[PDB]
Design a protein around this motif. Structure first.
Motif, mmCIF file in Angstrom:
data_model
loop_
_atom_site.group_PDB
_atom_site.id
_atom_site.type_symbol
_atom_site.label_atom_id
_atom_site.label_comp_id
_atom_site.label_asym_id
_atom_site.label_seq_id
_atom_site.Cartn_x
_atom_site.Cartn_y
_atom_site.Cartn_z
ATOM 1 N N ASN A 1 39.470 71.910 -125.600
ATOM 2 C CA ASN A 1 40.079 70.893 -126.441
ATOM 3 C C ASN A 1 41.337 71.465 -127.097
ATOM 4 O OD1 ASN A 1 39.462 71.883 -129.462
ATOM 5 N ND2 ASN A 1 37.710 72.312 -128.114
ATOM 6 N N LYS A 2 42.146 72.122 -126.279
ATOM 7 C CA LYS A 2 43.378 72.720 -126.764
ATOM 8 C C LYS A 2 44.184 71.665 -127.526
ATOM 9 C CE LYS A 2 43.696 76.928 -124.698
ATOM 10 N NZ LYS A 2 42.880 78.115 -125.043
ATOM 11 N N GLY A 3 44.179 70.456 -126.985
ATOM 12 C CA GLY A 3 44.903 69.358 -127.600
ATOM 13 C C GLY A 3 44.430 69.127 -129.038
ATOM 14 N N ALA A 4 43.280 69.706 -129.349
ATOM 15 C CA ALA A 4 42.711 69.571 -130.679
ATOM 16 C C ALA A 4 42.883 70.888 -131.438
ATOM 17 C CB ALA A 4 41.243 69.151 -130.567
#
Length: 11
Positions: free
Chosen positions: A3-6
């Motif tokens: 969840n890099k986007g997180a």
């Protein structure tokens, strides 16, 4: 993935 986007929550 990791969840890099997180990850922004604590890059």
């Amino acid at each position: 993935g990791s969840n890099k986007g997180a990850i922004i929550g604590l890059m």
